[PDB]
Amino acid sequence: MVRGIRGAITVEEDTPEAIHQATRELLLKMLEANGIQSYEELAAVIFTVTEDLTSAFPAEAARQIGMHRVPLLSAREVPVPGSLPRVIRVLALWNTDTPQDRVRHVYLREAVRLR
């Protein structure tokens, strides 16, 4: 079975370091919250970034924590008026027998308003 894991986190400046730092933190927490201690069962990980962020690919933060074998893809989020700014969102596809209602999703910082 495949279960999606959602995550979201905000930053306060479109810089490679800031983008990477937040992404690394989110990915590590999404995995920790679900007791995942290996990357072998992640089918793929998809990232989306709001329009106000274009300095670096979030996928690079995944490479930084050793996810070089995990398929990654990034896309742009819809610029909805009044929507939360500077947000990095993640959708991990996890091969697991963990029930849908047992999967833990992670919303950090300002993204907590998105849960």
95 makes contact with a copy of itself (CB under 8 A) = yes
- Cβ 25 to a copy of itself shortest distance, Å: 19
Instruction: Pick from 30, 61, 87, 91 the residue near a copy of itself by CB under 8 A.
Output: 91
Q: Which of residues 2-41 bind a copy of itself (CB under 8 A)?
A: 2-6, 39-41
User: Taking CA 18 as the corner, what is the angle to CA 25 and CA 6, rounded to the nearest 5 degrees?
Assistant: 40
**Type of residue at 109:** R
**Gap between the Cα atoms of 105 and 33, Å rounded:** 8
**Gap between the Cα atoms of 4 and 103, Å rounded:** 8
- Cβ 24 to a copy of itself shortest distance, Å: 16
78 makes contact with a copy of itself (CB under 8 A) = yes
Q: Which two tokens stand for residue 13?
A: 């400046």
- Asked whether 100 and 2 are in contact (CB, 8 A), the reply is no
In what helix (H) or strand (E) does residue 32 lie, and over which residues does it extend?
A: helix 16-33
Instruction: Pick from 15, 17, 52, 55 the residue near a copy of itself by CB under 8 A.
Output: 55
93 makes contact with a copy of itself (CB under 8 A) = yes
Binding site for a copy of itself (CB under 8 A): 1-6, 39-44, 46, 48-49, 53-57, 63, 68-81, 83, 89, 91, 93, 95, 99-101, 103, 105
